[PDB]
Design a protein around this ligand. Structure first.
Ligand SMILES: [Mg+2]
Ligand SMILES: [Mg+2]
Ligand SMILES: [Mg+2]
Ligand SMILES: [Mg+2]
Ligand SMILES: [Mg+2]
Ligand SMILES: [Mg+2]
Ligand SMILES: [Mg+2]
Ligand SMILES: [Mg+2]
Ligand SMILES: [Mg+2]
Lengths: 157, 120, 205
RNA sequence: GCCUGGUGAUAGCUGGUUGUCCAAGAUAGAAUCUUAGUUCAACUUUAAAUUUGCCCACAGAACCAAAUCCCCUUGUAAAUUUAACUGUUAGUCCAAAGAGGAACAGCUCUUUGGACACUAGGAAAAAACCUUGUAGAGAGAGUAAAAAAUUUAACACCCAUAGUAGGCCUAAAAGCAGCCACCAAUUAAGAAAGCGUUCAAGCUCAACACCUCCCAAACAUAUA
RNA sequence: ACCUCGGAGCAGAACCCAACCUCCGAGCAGUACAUGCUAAGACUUCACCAGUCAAAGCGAACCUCAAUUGAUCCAAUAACUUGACCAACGGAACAAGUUACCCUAGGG
């Protein structure tokens, strides 16, 4: 058999013993190492500007709609100067403690959309929400005073 | 082709790590080697068979004294895979004519010039 | 011309003198064309072998199929088939000279780059059809970037510096430690035990 | 034809060659009607005479790799010459460098080195691999080589409007028959990466909101 | 298809190294007529045979090429010399086809 073959040629036995003795040994540490120890500021400036803007705020669980249905809700609230805002609560949890909202820290989680306002059409917004047997009103906060949904009935009325 | 193998000189240059490992001093080195054949000349080329005959190592496991001079070291470099080399260390002096008969080369590598058979 | 040009079966000028199959044109690390030259991606050979014409058509055909010429260009690194491999007539008895020239071949050693790629393309784009191509080759090959090439060479340096094994093949072979050049090649003093025949051992330090 | 004689024809071919014990002893070749053989050489053997042999260090050996030659020291004990003759040669295998062949062959041909045609131990058995050589007796001891190790492939849950059925070509080909730009709206979904339709409409993806009959038996735990 | 001789690779660096291995060639021509005579020392195709180189000397002037070839005996010649594709090229002085009728001694 030639020195170059098509199959891996069988080594001489001392060749093979050399190859086994001179194998690579990796280092072993005494302790395993794994067992040892722009858009963000766009949201901060934008939503922080929305904090100082609104006198009244409300919020819902606006995930339970269709696209054209959210277009209808977008137009029926476009009829007012109220604004709706889908934004991550991931950044909104440091937003509240920045804006000194300690009663609003247990408010903003899961799917939610802001209803920031200065003029309450929120009674008529409830009039739009009464025809759909879901999507409840989550509590707001006008001028560092919290609004329960009962408070939305009282203030909205 | 299988040929006679030159070995480069960097192989025979000790490092201070090796002076920490074995018991050697680069200044004031040893005079005499003890060489022992520990491997067969069978299945070895004829030149290695010859060098084993020149150094006087035909019988295995029998120590032989040599000089630590570059000629003898050249022959030892040819058959360094068949032999074992240790420095002949001498705790007491080299033996005088009084102590010539009563010697014994111990296993350690030392050659004691008074070999009683009593315990210390 | 951002495509693979046609590689002919045999050059225009023939080679009238027959050649001995010096298979040491497959053995060992390649010297020619190991690094990139105005390329970004290649098909590195992890082993040696012979390229036929049919291999060259597998690469030209199955690369120029799936290739954006406005985004990607490509260069042959391995030349045209120039080594005349002979075959004797089928079922004829031995002796009577050396057989007539059958077909030409290129030798490719290990560490050779075969086909360079270039242009406005990421590596993950070009992994696919260069892995298909790299599997259709006769030898073990691999699609390699520039950063992946220097990555695995730095890995080989890490292996050569990290190992807690006092005995390497280089220290044993070159010193002739266990009388072991009786079993080794004279090439094993320069291959350093990473090449056996035409193969390549990447895992072996 | 057969018989007797020549005739113990001749046979480079086959077969066979009878006490004991010890010793030394194996692989270049050149010619040849030659390759089933001989002759010379090489190697081998005995006897004799003498003086170096072997290993080798610097220096040194050509232009168009491994090494070798040469070689004082040194380590050794052989070498050359003289006399006299026989015998042996298609060696085989392994490692290496190659050639022919299919980078087949227990295939063919060279080179270097081993081993075998010489012992014993190991590798299942075992010419050629590894360990090991010089011979006897021992119901002592220390060692050498020396026991195959492995077992694999889960994967992001969502979520999708609008300029628009992007222009041109195309019966229309709309992100998806092709060219080109590939901007833009909300907070954000590509003038589109895969199904899909003549074309559509419908489905996913990125991104948004939560994140002939198997073949030792066996055995994972006690300090090398 | 070949049989002798030489060059190159194989066979990289002293010498040597095969193949019905890879490629080139040779079987002469030309010039000179001291291409006279002698002679230390050497090389050598792995033997022998053949081959090569050569200082000094006497005598005179003032070979190129790689191979370029053939033993002994016998002939021819007064002598000096000359004599083979003896190419199967170490050459028998001169001898073809075939045998399922073959035969014998052996080998696979
Ligand atoms: Mg007879
Ligand atoms: Mg005969
Ligand atoms: Mg004997
Ligand atoms: Mg003849
Ligand atoms: Mg014969
Ligand atoms: Mg000398
Ligand atoms: Mg000679
Ligand atoms: Mg003849
Ligand atoms: Mg002849």
């Amino acid at each position: 058999s030639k020195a170059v073959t098509r199959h891996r040629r069988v080594m001489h036995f001392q060749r093979q013993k050399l190859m086994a003795v001179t194998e690579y040994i990796p280092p072993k540490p005494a302790i395993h190492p794994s067992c040892l120890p722009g858009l963000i500021r766009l949201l901060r400036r934008e939503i922080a500007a929305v904090f100082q803007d609104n006198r009244m705020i409300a919020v819902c669980q606006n995930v339970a709609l269709s696209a054209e249905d959210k277009l209808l809700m977008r137009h029926q609230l476009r009829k007012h100067k109220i604004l709706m805002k889908v934004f991550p609560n991931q950044v909104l949890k440091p937003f509240l403690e920045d804006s000194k909202y300690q009663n609003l820290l247990p408010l903003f989680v899961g799917h939610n959309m802001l209803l920031v306002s200065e003029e309450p059409k929120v009674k008529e917004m409830v009039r739009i929400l009464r025809t759909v047997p879901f999507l409840p009103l989550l509590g707001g906060c006008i001028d560092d005073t919290i609004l329960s949904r009962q408070g939305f009935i009282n203030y909205s009325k | 082709k299988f040929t006679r193998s030159r070995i480069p000189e960097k192989v025979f240059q000790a490092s201070p790590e090796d002076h920490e490992k074995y018991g050697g001093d680069p200044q004031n080195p040893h005079k005499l080697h003890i060489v022992t054949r520990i491997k067969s000349t069978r299945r070895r080329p004829y030149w290695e068979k010859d060098i084993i005959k020149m150094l006087g190592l035909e019988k295995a496991h029998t120590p032989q004294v040599h000089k630590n001079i570059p000629s003898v070291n050249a022959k030892l470099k040819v058959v360094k895979h068949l032999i074992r080399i240790k420095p002949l260390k001498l705790p007491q002096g080299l033996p005088a004519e009084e102590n010539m008969s009563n010697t014994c080369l111990k296993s350690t590598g030392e050659l004691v010039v008074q070999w009683h058979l009593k315990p210390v | 011309k951002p495509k693979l040009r046609f590689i002919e079966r045999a050059p225009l000028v023939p080679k009238v003198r027959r050649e001995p199959k010096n298979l040491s044109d497959i053995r060992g690390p390649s010297t020619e064309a190991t690094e990139f030259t105005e390329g970004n991606f290649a098909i590195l050979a992890l082993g040696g072998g012979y390229l036929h014409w049919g291999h060259f058509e597998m690469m030209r055909l199955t690369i120029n199929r799936s290739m954006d010429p406005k985004n990607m260009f490509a260069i042959w690194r391995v030349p045209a088939p120039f080594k005349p491999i002979t075959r004797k007539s089928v079922g004829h008895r031995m002796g009577g000279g050396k057989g007539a020239i059958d077909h030409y071949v290129t030798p490719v050693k290990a560490g050779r780059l075969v086909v360079e790629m270039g242009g406005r393309c990421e590596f993950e784009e070009v992994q696919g059809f260069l892995d298909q191509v790299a599997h259709k080759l006769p030898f073990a090959a691999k699609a390699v970037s520039r950063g992946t090439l220097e990555k695995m060479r730095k890995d080989q340096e890490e292996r050569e510096r990290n190992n807690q094994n006092p005995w390497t093949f280089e220290r044993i072979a070159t010193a002739n430690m266990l009388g072991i050049r009786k079993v080794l090649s004279p090439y094993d003093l320069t291959h350093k035990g990473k090449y056996w025949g035409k193969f390549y051992m990447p895992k072996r330090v």
